[PDB]
Amino acid sequence: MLNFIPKRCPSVSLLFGKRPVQRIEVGQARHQLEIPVETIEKIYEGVDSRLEYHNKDYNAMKWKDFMKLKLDAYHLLEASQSETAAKSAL
């Protein structure tokens, strides 16, 4: 994934927080996934506003947080690839 976080201003992302939920399509099969808007808003605390790209519609996160996120993704992916993975995240 890229470090491009869409601006939640209505001129860019119309209707961001009008409802308490976000939805996304995942993969080639386009599975649906719903995510709480608070879980999402947790990103805009690490978002950095000095940086703006792609027609000034996307900000960038701080590398610390972005790489923590990438590491969680990578851990999940390698666990999926492996077979001795733990049956729980506890």
Partner 1 sequence: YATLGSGWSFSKVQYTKYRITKPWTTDTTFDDIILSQPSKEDFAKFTKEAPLFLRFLKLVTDVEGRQEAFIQFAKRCENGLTVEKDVYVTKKELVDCLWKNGYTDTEINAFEIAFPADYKFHYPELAVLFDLTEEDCYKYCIRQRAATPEELVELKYTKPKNLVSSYGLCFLGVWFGLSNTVLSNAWFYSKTFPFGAVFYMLGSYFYRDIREKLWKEEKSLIHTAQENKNMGEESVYKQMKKYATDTKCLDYL
Partner 2 sequence: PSGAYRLPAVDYKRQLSRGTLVEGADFYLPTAQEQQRLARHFEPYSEQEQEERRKFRFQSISVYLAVALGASFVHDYFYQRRPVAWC
Partner 3 sequence: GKIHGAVWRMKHLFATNFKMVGHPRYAYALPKNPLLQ
List residues binding partner 1 (CB under 8 A).
9-16, 18-24, 26-29, 31, 33-34, 37, 54-55, 57, 73, 76-77, 79-81, 87-90
CB-CB contact of 50 with 56 (8 Å)? no
Interface stretch with partner 2, choices 16-24, 30-38, 63-71, 81-89 (CB under 8 A): 63-71
79 lies in the binding site for partner 3 (CB under 8 A): yes
53 lies in the binding site for partner 2 (CB under 8 A): no
Could you identify the residue written with the tokens 């950095």?
A: 48
63 lies in the binding site for partner 2 (CB under 8 A): yes
- Residues in binding contact with partner 3, number by CB under 8 A: 17
Classify residue 59 as exposed, middle or buried by CB count within 10 Å of its CB (0-12, 13-18, 19+).
Answer: buried
* Neighbour count for residue 41 (Cβ, 10 Å): 14
